[PDB]
Amino acid sequence: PLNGLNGLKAFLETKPKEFDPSRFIQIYKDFKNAFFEIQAKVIHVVGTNGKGSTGRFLTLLLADQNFKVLHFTSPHVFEFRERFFLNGSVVGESVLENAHQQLQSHAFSSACSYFEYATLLAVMLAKDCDYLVLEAGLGGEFDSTNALKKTLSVFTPIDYDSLESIAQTKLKAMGSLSIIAPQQELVLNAAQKIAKEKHAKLIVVQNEISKGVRDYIERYHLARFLAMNLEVALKAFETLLPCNKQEVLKNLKPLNLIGRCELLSPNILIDVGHNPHSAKALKEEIKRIFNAKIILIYNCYQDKDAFLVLEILKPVIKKVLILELHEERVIKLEKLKGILETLGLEYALFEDVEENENYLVYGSFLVANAFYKRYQEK
Template sequence: MHLTEFLAKKGAEYAPFDPSRAVRIFERFKEDFLPIFSPKVIHIVGTNGKGSTGRMIARGLKNVMHFTSPHLFTINERFYLNGVNIQMSVLEDTHQVLIQKPYMQEASYFEYLTFLCLFLSKECEYLVLEAGLGGEFDSTNVLKDKISVFTQIGLDHCEILGESLEQIATTKLNSMGKVAFLGIQRYTQILPIAQNIAKSKGSTLYTLSHTLLPPFAMPEFLLENLTLASKVLDFLGAGYELGEIAKIDLQGRMQKYSPHITLDVGHNPDGARAVAREFEGKKITLVYNAYKQKDIFEVLSILSPIIKEVQIIAVEDERIVQREELEKILKNLDIKYSNFEAIKENEETLVFGSFSVVREFLERV
């Protein structure tokens, strides 16, 4: 079975949770495929900013794999080796090796991709390994010898990770290795939780409170991520140019698609706050849709001061909120809305939402 078919049969990316499954598979996987695993692991955990922070770190290193998620169009976007995405044919060949072991059938969608990454990176000098939703029980946390990098932690995926910020932060921060970096945080509760966990684990924790001077004009949240990435690179003794690592090549991170069109895959309240700061004082057209489990009312409330009109882009996905529910929220917030049909020339437009929203926009435009 081809890789794409195999993954399609897995269903949802984040399968019913079993904290022991990845650990159990990893023990056998290690015996069969990783007798020697040489990379220095930089484990990226957080709610917002994992992808951009990880990519900035990877751009400052040599002989490095960056494993990130999710992808916009093709699965190989998640596997970035020395500046380019790994070819699909290489992923397919690796899959055909791993799948010979019956125990690999047990892995969930995301777990299987994690093991693909470990196999492909085993001879690299560095592995920048981005967690999925969680931390402590994430499949990427099977590796214990690592440097932990915590980006901004906030409320998201509450249906999986917990209803309170303290619960979510504890789950993520419990993945802490012996050396850890805590990026600039919006919520004051995060720091004491991190300090207590570091003390209990005997970890060395470096915390950030101020940003660097930017090498060029950039959004505040990306500058925070750049500051965090640079601190990690300094610790590793990497030689890098700040302006070069800041030029990330990931789509959808406040990406200027054209002079008047910005793409951002933020989909939670903290992501909305970051975007609202960048467009403060302006009125924009918002091309938008969202998954039904997201806090849509809160996101649109935060963005409302900058919105001239919402254009609802239809997305074929069972997780997308019902159109009637989205319209009800927009009416309650007194936000003008219409269907997305085409971009209006020379009009400031923000495409904001999940990866599926940005992907749908790019496929149409």
């Protein structure tokens, strides 16, 4: 399907995943000429944390109103097609290969970067959708998703050169109508200044969780996801559909994201997070699922509070197996060893999983995807 000489998998391998802002603007113009100007209303999800859950919550609410929605996310945990959540499910392989087959014969498709091609695939897949929930990549203000006309932007919490510089690149591409989750003070200030400069409407989400959202989270034991992420998605929903007065949380299905609190096997739990909030939720899920101390397979980036996360997990962790990663912004090995020694956690390097033991794989998309490849090859 996605395989073969002309398949999508081979085409993506000609685009090694790791600069010309004018490129995709030109690519997208050619796409619209050669194909179509998408009619779906486009929601641009921009931020540092909570992009995935905020966007998927909004997608689920819209789908519950019998709307056709595509949710475009990045990166992926196990398979590339995770990036396209179409009409309530991950896109089928043959549907994705068919979109690729239509695109690949055009020059602008060969000019695409890896992520730029994924963006065009999302637009192709969403041709007949009512809404396109479009998560920004790492391109900043020149991100490929910036080239599509937007109905609404949703700014999830922004965090870590400087924080002001991060906020600037994300917020500068705000359109006429945007929802902003609770932010740090300088980020809210920067957003308000830009909105005034652009005559735009900025809807500031109150730092407040409704009973309906609390009830939904407790009813499904969804502590894995910040309640505020659903509050922001609900505000987006109400902003898109101001005439809807239904109690949409009562029949909202439980949120499930691939690679979040996911049992890959009876003895392997996998999660791409790295946060005190997700660590607490995984501790609780470890207690429910295994009801014993387990082994942690772990690494993290240099910018994260590894100490606190490991301290939170320690009560249910008997040993840490460090998943050696040489990518550059990963924490240095000896520094991580010192945190584990401060905490009193036995550790070693990860090599293989034993069938008689239980494991949590945790730390990043990178940690989970790199584990999965080594696990795949047995």
